[PDB]
């Protein structure tokens with residue numbers, strides 16, 4: 222819908238449909254006008270905020286507005302008219318160079334499990350030193366318990382998180398404290414329950430498919446209209462919620478043979494309105510992130526799993542699944558200096574040459590992390606990294622990524638040493654999709670807890686039980702990162718021995734000692750932070766025997 226004066230126009234794209242009725246609960250049932258492209262319209266003046274509606278089909282069946290701005294009673298319920306309060310700054314205050322990201326899943330972040338709860342932690346976040354929070358998909362999904370990837374109404378803010386007014390409030394309040402909100406949005410597929418679009422027109426592709434559901438149609442017959450639906454969604458989050466930016470989910474699953482790729486156009490929209498886009502890409506292809514004049518889509522930054530895997534594999538000894546491609550110290554140094562470990566070499570996991578070099582792009586085209594919703598949640602037993610390594614090792618990990626040239630991302634809970642798992646959970650009601658997610662989860666991941674069990678979700682709620690030592694260490698890591706100008710700067714000299722490595726920047730050097738070992742230190746510096754009490758205040762060039770631990774010098 223659109224609010225013009227006293228009156229509101231309803232627009233529904235539905236080429237498969239012969240005629241559609243607008244049905245406003247308590248008001249009437251109105252026949253809509255059809256243009257030759259398959260759009261049905263009607264201008265109404267008896268309509269006010271909070272009115273509810275559905276569309277009734279050829280079928281006589283009723284369905285919610287797929288473009289709904291609010292789904293008060295979940296995915297099968299009526300759509301409802303929201304206040305179009307359309308103030309948005311023309312510019313985000315977030316500077317990409319300065320970005321430190323905090324990943325949040327509203328549902329489990331906080332005893333409340335709502336936006337209100339996240340507002341309550343804003344001081345904490347601000348003080349920690351984070352500059353922007355990334356919110357996992359809030360697009361209306363079935364039930365109350367879901368990561369968000371089963372979202373099925375791209376424009377509706379999940380009822381149970383506190384709806385539109387809550388999300389709006391969360392972003393006004395984070396702006397008030399000087400933090401940005403980044404929104405995780407899903408354009409690659411659509412959840413299995415509560416999707417009605419199939420009945421309306423070719424929203425989805427015959428050609429291609431994703432593991433998680435039906436993919437959008439961007440390049441076959443009738444795709445102008447769907448390109449539009451997605452592009453207007455990024456416009457909408459910006460204007461109607463004043464979001465600062467986006468993390469785009471699984472971009473490698475957004476397939477488009479059009480003359481200009483839909484991803485280049487998404488970036489275009491966000492840049493038109495001066496915002497930030499991060500892509501999750503498994504492609505290891507600089508094309509996602511390269512400028513247009515270099516044939517790229519010009520997305521601002523992309524997740525680099527190779528950094529995370531390097532660290533995790535090495536430190537944990539783990540080799541299941543994608544970890545088989547990793548394990549050596551080498552892999553960490555590689556990712557530390559060429560960004561991608563798979564930059565065009567053979568992957569035994571994938572059984573093909575994977576990736577491409579990234580060139581001279583600086584570090585702030587990439588985001589790195591030792592934890593996140595996937596790298597915890599996709600483990601059968603949801604274990605956080607903190608269960609898989611010792612204490613020294615955990616802090617060494619935090620240092621490796623927060624002191625890296627790349628944009629770092631903390632996974633809610635990581636900073637204070639959360640020990641509770643993060644499981645896959647879902648809340649479908651359809652007994653065939655309940656049966657399907659359980660059997661799927663059991664076999665891709667070896668997940669023994671039931672995703673549809675409420676306890677599984679509860680187990681995943683952050684404890685807020687603070688480990689002051691770990692928390693303090695993060696606080697300083699973040700501070701020192703800013704003071705030392707580490708951000709984006711790829712000019713780092715890295716030496717390694719069997720069980721240690723030293724990384725040296727323009728302003729600093731770090732000691733990463735994985736086992737007691739004897740090291741030649743080529744620099745002089747004074748100590749900024751350390752994982753132990755065993756490193757000197759001031760060190761000089763010379764050879765030293767260190768115990769497992771990390772240290773930072775200037």
Ligand SMILES: OC[C@H]1O[C@H](O[C@H]2[C@H](O)[C@@H](O)[C@@H](O[C@H]3[C@H](O)[C@@H](O)[C@@H](O[C@H]4[C@H](O)[C@@H](O)[C@@H](O[C@@H]5[C@@H](O)[C@@H](O)O[C@H](CO)[C@H]5O)O[C@@H]4CO)O[C@@H]3CO)O[C@@H]2CO)[C@H](O)[C@@H](O)[C@@H]1O
Nearest residue numbers: 370371413432433434470471501503595599657658661662
């Ligand atoms: O009817 C359609 C479809 O339904 C069924 O599929 C079910 C799956 O079996 C079940 O596992 C579940 O999938 C979950 C994933 O388990 C979970 O990992 C998550 O994944 C999202 C990530 O969180 C997100 O960050 C992103 O990450 C990556 C990709 O970038 C890339 O590297 O590939 C991996 C490998 O999977 C991803 O982790 O993208 C993910 C998806 O957006 O969320 C999904 C969705 O909830 O869910 C469905 C049903 O709930 C059925 O079995 C299937 O056969 C059928 O075709």
